[PDB]
């Protein structure tokens, strides 16, 4: 038994990135759980955690962070930025993806915080966030 979660955004809310794991292509497996839009690490171990956002002076950002008791509180694990500047004549588009492998304790809380929400292209294809144990 090996845990994996795959969360997609709820497109109804468009002005906030709410994670849901109910659809046919979004799920919790073998122990993953949710807790105020955070993913609760089911067991201490090594996980590959990934997430992607798509966008359609403007600042764009999207970080997957790990919540901690000590010093910085919100410790980011995967972050990426992108500046788009006025001079907008085309249907510009952009996809920040990133995943990695981390050491996590049980009950760890993965959450994602993004700048440029109203530009998000909410879909099972584009905006998502999940992790799997190895």
């Amino acid at each position, epitope marked *: 038994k090996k845990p994996a979660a795959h969360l997609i955004g709820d497109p109804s809310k468009q002005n906030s990135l709410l994670w849901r794991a109910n659809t046919d292509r979004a*799920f919790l497996q073998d122990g993953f*759980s949710l807790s105020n839009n955070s993913l*609760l690490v089911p067991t201490s171990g090594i996980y590959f955690v990934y997430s992607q956002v798509v966008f359609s002076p403007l600042y764009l950002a999207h970080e997957v962070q790990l919540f901690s008791s000590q010093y910085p509180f919100h410790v980011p694990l995967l972050s990426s930025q992108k500046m788009v500047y006025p001079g907008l004549q085309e249907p510009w588009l952009h996809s920040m993806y990133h995943g990695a492998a981390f050491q996590l304790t049980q009950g760890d809380q993965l959450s994602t915080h993004t700048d440029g929400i109203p530009h998000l292209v909410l879909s099972p294809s584009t905006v998502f966030f999940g992790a799997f144990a190895l």
Partner: antibody
Amino acid sequence: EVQLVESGGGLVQPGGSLRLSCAASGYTFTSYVIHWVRQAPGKGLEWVGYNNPYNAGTNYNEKFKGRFTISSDKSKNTAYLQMNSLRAEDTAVYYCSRPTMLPWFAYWGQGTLVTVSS
Amino acid sequence: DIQMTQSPSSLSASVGDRVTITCRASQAVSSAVAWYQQKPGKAPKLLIYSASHRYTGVPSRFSGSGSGTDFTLTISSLQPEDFATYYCQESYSTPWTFGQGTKVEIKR
């Protein structure tokens, strides 16, 4: 083998305070979280919160946030629930339980009784 | 914050009967549901996780099913030690609520 043992339940007057202790043994204490679940006399089960004894990364059922505080002492394989300003609602059996994956309450304690009366 | 709703408050059944209890989720919950049997005064016991996997040491006569919104616990050959209050529980998201429970009185 795995053994959870609550202790310290008893009589508390309304608005009072009481702390419950849960002693662990038979699994490496610091790589598993301790839950606290309660149940009012002959009623359902209610999850209070949990604490990771390694990094103190507690997570509460908000119903008790800033009124209950779960701590732990990995030097003594023990989890703690302190409950402030107790009431009628809060009179119950208080269980501590350590899981397999987080949301699967696997092993339970025997539970301990806090009665809240005058 | 999800609620759960167990179908029979209680039920009488006789040894060997097929006992089936249903629990309905207030929203879709993938398949993250657990089933616990308690007994009197003693602590609950884990019977089923992830909606259908039996737990270590759970008698085969215990079986879990359910899809997304509605779930079901079934016992094939009801023993007398198969008596308690059976709680369902969404393991999907915190605060991991329990249904009301279902009490079983064996006929004799």
